[PDB]
Structure formats: C-alpha cells, structure tokens
C-alpha cells in the first residue's frame with residue numbers, strides 16, 4: 001500500500017465526521033447528530049418512595065420546586081424549539097467549507113481571558129490543572145493507568161484558551177504540553193482502551209475542533225445560531241466535547257465486569273449527561289457571577305434550570321446512573337472549588353501552582369518536545 | 382397515676398441523656414458517647430477497580446492526593462488525640478450543674494451575626510429557609526409527609542441564631558414559628574415515625590440544647606475544651622446535632638422495604654456521616670472565607686481535611702452509603718448555593734425572601750401561636 005501522508009482538508013474532516021456520526025433525530029443533521037431532543041423532555045412528579053438502588057441517590061439532587069429557596073436559582077421555563085432548523089445550519093457550513101481558509105490570523109493566540117497569560121504552554125499547564133480537577137470532581141482518580149484519558153481532557157479544554165487550527169491539531173504541528181494528538185491516541189491504545197472506543201473519542205475531538213474553529217472562521221455561523229437557542233445549545237455541547245470526555249471517563253470508572261462503552265448502545269444516557277454538565281456549568285458560572293448568549297439573559301437562565309432538572313431526573317433511571325448523575329451535576333461542586341473559576345472572580349488573575357499541585361502535574365509534561373521558550377514551565381514540579 | 386407537670390432541671394436533663402446514651406468508647410464519657418474514634422481512622426489506597434454498586438459512586442468523591450490541585454484545599458495532617466480526657470469534661474459539667482442557673486441574662490437575644498435581624502420569629506423564618514435548603518441538598522424532597530422532620534431541622538438550627546434556655550425549649554415557652562417542641566414530637570408521631578426513632582431524635586435534641594447552653598452558661602467549659610482539639614470536635618458535633626437530623630432524614634429517605642432506623646444497629650455509619658458533614662461545613666466555610674477554633678488555624682484546616690477524606694472513604698462500604706455519602710459531603714454544594722452563607726459574604730446582610738420561597742415556607746408557620754409583634758412575617762407567602 002503506497003504511503004500517503006496528506007493532511008485532510010477541513011472539508012474532508014467535516015465529511016468524515018458526517019459519515020461517522022450520521023444524522024441525529026432530524027434528517028440532514030449530520031454531524032450535529034444528537035438523538036435526544038432536549039425540548040421534548042418531561043418532568044415527572046417525585047413520589048418520594050425510592051429503593052436503595054434508585055438512581056436518585058447519585059449526584060446532587062435538587063428538585064425543581066425547591067429551587068426558589070435559593071436566591072441564585074429560581075423558577076424554570078421551557079425553551080423554544082428551533083432544533084428542526086439544524087439542516088439549514090449544516091447546509092450553510094457545507095457551503096462555507098467549499099472556500100474556507102486553512103489558517104486564521106489569530107491562530108496561536110492566547111484566548112484565556114486572563115491577561116497574566118503570555119506563554120501558550122503555561123496556559124496548557126493551567127488547563128491541565130483544571131483537567132485533573134474536573135476529572136476528580138466527576139469521580140475519577142489520579143492513577144497512572146488513566147494518564148492518557150486525562151491528557152484527552154486537556155486537549156478538550158485547551159482550544160478555549162488557545163486558538164488552534166484543526167489542521168495543526170491533526171498533523172502534529174500543535175502539541176499540548178509536548179504531546180501531539182497522535183501521542184494521545186497511541187497512549188490510549190497502550191492503556192487498553194478498545195480501538196472502537198478510541199475512534200469514537202477521536203471523532204468527538206475532531207468534531208469539537210471543527211465546530212469551535214467554524215465559530216471563528218465563519219462570521220455568518222454564530223449570527224445564524226444565536227437566534228436559534230435550542231440549536232445553539234446543541235452546538236455548544238459539541239464545542240465542549242462533554243460527550244467525548246464522558247466516553248473515556250466511563251471507560252476508566254465503569255465496572256470491569258460490564259462490557260465496553262459503546263455509544264451505539266448508550267447514546268441516550270450519554271447525551272443527557274453531556275448536556276446536563278454543560279447546562280450545570282453555565283448555571284453555576286452565572287450564579288457565581290463569572291457572546292454566545294442571546295436575548296433576555298434572565299429567560300435563558302430559566303431555560304437552563306428547566307433543562308437541568310429534566311436531564312437529571314431522566315438520568316435517575318439510566319443503566320449508568322451510578323456515574324452519569326455525578327457527571328451531570330458535578331459543576332455544582334467543582335465550579336465553587338476550582339482555581340479556574342476562582343481566578344476569574346479575583347479579577348481574572350492566575351493563582352500560583354504550589355509545589356503539591358506542580359508535583360502532580362509534572363508527569364503530564366513532555367519536556368523533551370517543548371519549545372525553548374517554555375523549557376522553564378512548572379519549575380517546582 | 383397522679384398528674385405531675387414539673388419541668389426537669391438542667392441537672393435532671395443531663396442525667397436523663399446520660400442514662401439514655403450511655404458511654405462512648407471511653408469509660409465515663411456519657412452523654413458524650415460516640416463509639417467511633419476519629420483519631421484512629423485509617424486511609425486505604427484506592428485500587429481504582431470498583432463495582433457499579435460501590436459506595437464510592439455516592440456523594441462527592443475527592444481523593445486526598447488530588448486536594449493539592451485546589452488552592453483553597455491542600456495537604457492533610459492527623460489531629461492530636463485528647464479524646465480520653467472526656468471523662469474530665471463530664472466530671473466538670475456534673476459539678477457545674479450542681480449550682481447552675483436556670484436562666485441566663487441574654488436569653489432570647491438574637492445571635493445570628495446579621496445586624497438586620499431584630500425579630501426572633503423572622504430569624505426563625507430565615508432558619509426555616511436554610512433548613513429546607515439543607516434538607517434538599519442532602520437529597521430530600523418537600524413532600525408534606527416530612528413536614529415535621531423539616532421542623533426538627535429548624536429546631537436544630539435556631540439555637541445558633543437565637544439564645545434559647547433548655548427549660549423554655551422543653552416546657553413549651555419557646556416556640557419555633559409558633560410550634561412548641563412537643564408539637565414537633567407529636568407531629569412526628571402523626572407522620573408515622575416509630576416511637577423509638579422519635580425518642581432517639583428527641584434525646585439528640587435534648588443533648589444539643591444542653592451542650593450549646595453549657596457553652597454559654599459555664600465560662601470554664603469552652604476554655605477546657607478549646608485546648609483538647611479532638612474533644613472539641615466531638616462536642617461541636619453534638620451541638621450541631623447532625624446525628625439527630627440524620628436519623629430523621631434517613632427515616633424519610635430510606636428504602637421502605639428496609640427496617641426502621643435504629644442507632645443501636647447503625648451507630649458507626651451514622652456517627653461517621655454526622656462528623657463528616659460538620660467537618661465539610663467548616664472546610665467549605667473557611668475555604669469561601671466566612672471562638673471555638675484554637676491555636677494555629679492553618680493546622681486545624683489540615684486536620685479537617687484529614688478527617689474528611691477518612692470519613693468519606695469509610696462511608697463507601699457502609700450499608701447506607703447510598704444516603705450517607707451525600708449527607709457527609711453535601712456542604713461542598715450547599716455552602717456555595719445557600720443564601721445563609723452568601724449573605725455572610727455580602728457583609729452579613731439578609732437576602733429578601735422572594736414570593737416563590739415565601740409560598741414554600743408559609744405552611745411551616747403556625748400563625749395562630751405567634752406573638753403580635755410577629756404577625757406580619759412572611760407577608761408575601
């Protein structure tokens with residue numbers, strides 16, 4: 001077989017994830033392909049009678065009717081549905097990709113929103129601090145056999161704080177703390193993640209990189225989504241890649257006796273949990289007081305709480321409630337505790353990485369592949 | 382049987398809870414009678430292999446070794462043990478009670494620490510807001526069949542914000558939102574709580590009222606406890622009455638098929654969970670930045686985290702992990718969300734009770750038994 005090495009174009013990448021994910025519940029939605037329709041979720045009254053094994057005992061349980069007790073919360077409202085317009089968004093993106101540039105002017109710029117940041121590897125180190133912090137609040141440990149799943153979280157987090165081109169992400173030009181993306185894929189193989197699970201997580205990452213890049217490369221896209229609230233939420237969940245991170249978290253945390261994690265068999269519960277965590281994050285950040293948001297911000301908040309309570313209740317009865325309830329609601333404890341968000345409250349500064357944290361993070365840095373400008377990161381590690 | 386109506390003296394109350402609780406793990410400790418020795422707890426390494434039914438999946442899971450990732454957390458340190466001095470504390474209290482006054486000068490004064498508070502029934506209303514807020518974050522609902530268990534939480538919370546004499550608490554002179562203590566006991570009977578469970582919760586409340594009153598009535602007591610850290614913690618857990626509140630929460634939340642909640646059969650897990658919640662509260666309040674604390678506050682914090690992680694790990698394997706893990710760690714999400722603590726951050730003000738919260742709280746007020754000065758509380762309810 002002749003050795004071909006051409007990096008796919010963004011158009012070909014888009015086509016590839018279209019073919020892999022297929023359509024969601026709307027025809028022509030690929031690759032925006034969720035099967036759960038958030039707008040149709042129903043909330044059932046709680047009878048108060050629960051078995052010890054009931055899923056309500058996992059995660060954080062805050063009933064809808066109790067939310068008025070908390071001033072930072074309140075009442076809920078069903079969101080308007082524009083989800084059936086998804087085919088129009090995909091058609092628009094197909095057209096844009098016929099003449100899209102492979103590079104943007106600000107590629108490589110820091111976008112963390114914290115003026116202290118001047119080195120992109122230092123930003124990656126902070127993102128790695130955050131990635132282990134999320135992993136822990138989801139229920140995970142720091143054992144060495146999950147090293148590369150944690151690196152995956154880092155790759156999922158850094159595109160928000162550093163502008164990365166999908167091409168450079170794919171072809172090894174971009175490195176996260178010295179790691180190429182292929183290093184993560186190869187590492188997941190060394191850890192024993194099945195090839196099918198790796199490729200699902202891989203395609204989710206492709207989709208994240210593409211959708212986040214389109215938001216910056218195509219000036220028509222965000223205006224097109226901003227006015228379609230329910231659709232913007234679908235899109236934001238893809239740019240957050242909570243689904244890909246969840247798949248690998250489940251692989252690390254699931255009962256060994258249980259079979260491998262297949263999205264084909266568990267898409268419903270995984271999608272519900274991925275949406276719940278995104279909504280919880282936005283809930284918690286707003287409540288604490290730290291543009292994609294459109295229209296009346298007060299109404300958008302009532303919609304998030306509507307979605308949150310229904311996502312969480314549905315997760316009560318799902319086969320993996322024992323992981324997905326906590327994944328869905330973890331923002332309620334990780335946002336108040338994590339430096340990432342406390343730094344923003346404190347005038348968007350940077351907390352020092354003390355020696356204990358630095359020693360934890362040291363092994364995640366491939367110092368041999370860093371640029372000379374970054375050889376001195378994590379010095380106390 | 383001749384009708385006798387004399388209110389017990391504080392000495393007789395003390396004797397009664399001594400006879401009821403008996404000794405803890407130290408001889409002569411009654412009624413400071415915990416059987417678990419916090420100082421002896423051991424932390425086991427996590428193998429990372431867990432069944433779906435493992436208790437680690439309940440509550441919030443933050444491993445000890447991950448805590449350095451969070452600037453507001455850090456490392457841990459084992460506390461020094463003075464628990465075997467408990468007999469000296471009880472002996473001292475026995476002597477003080479031989480000539481103790483039945484009334485203190487500031488009895489009836491507001492002690493909430495929020496200058497806005499001028500009416501003790503309004504303070505009780507705010508405490509009721511908080512009581513339902515704690516109940517919800519523990520996992521409970523607002524269903525009417527748990528009304529009087531929630532009133533119990535209110536009685537457990539108000540002694541911190543209003544100075545109450547044990548005599549007036551007992552004999553019906555003190556009313557919480559128009560409810561006497563006997564009204565709560567009778568209400569718990571109407572709700573179907575077994576007599577033995579009610580009397581356990583009752584004795585826990587007696588013990589809370591006595592121990593909190595002794596701290597103010599006996600100027601020698603706090604100096605005696607302050608220097609015995611591990612003992613002060615035992616005492617503070619009794620003044621918080623997390624054990625009594627837990628017993629009734631479990632009654633409301635437990636599997637119906639399971640038997641009644643008997644402290645005689647479940648004291649170990651209940652004590653561990655009661656300690657964990659108190660330690661979590663203090664952890665979370667300090668981390669957020671809101672005197673019993675003695676010596677080097679930095680060291681005391683390392684001790685709290687030591688106790689927290691060991692309490693939580695032990696709860697993984699207990700029969701009621703499916704309730705007690707969340708009870709133990711709930712402070713990690715209820716402290717950031719509850720008005721009680723947000724008010725203190727905001728210059729110890731009072732957030733308005735909006736119409737939604739007021740409508741929730743209305744049924745907990747017995748307006749027929751309020752003093753005329755308080756007839757206008759919760760007007761929007």
Ligand SMILES: [Zn+2]
Nearest residue numbers: 039081083230
């Ligand atoms: Zn919709």
Ligand SMILES: [Zn+2]
Nearest residue numbers: 420462464611
């Ligand atoms: Zn001890």
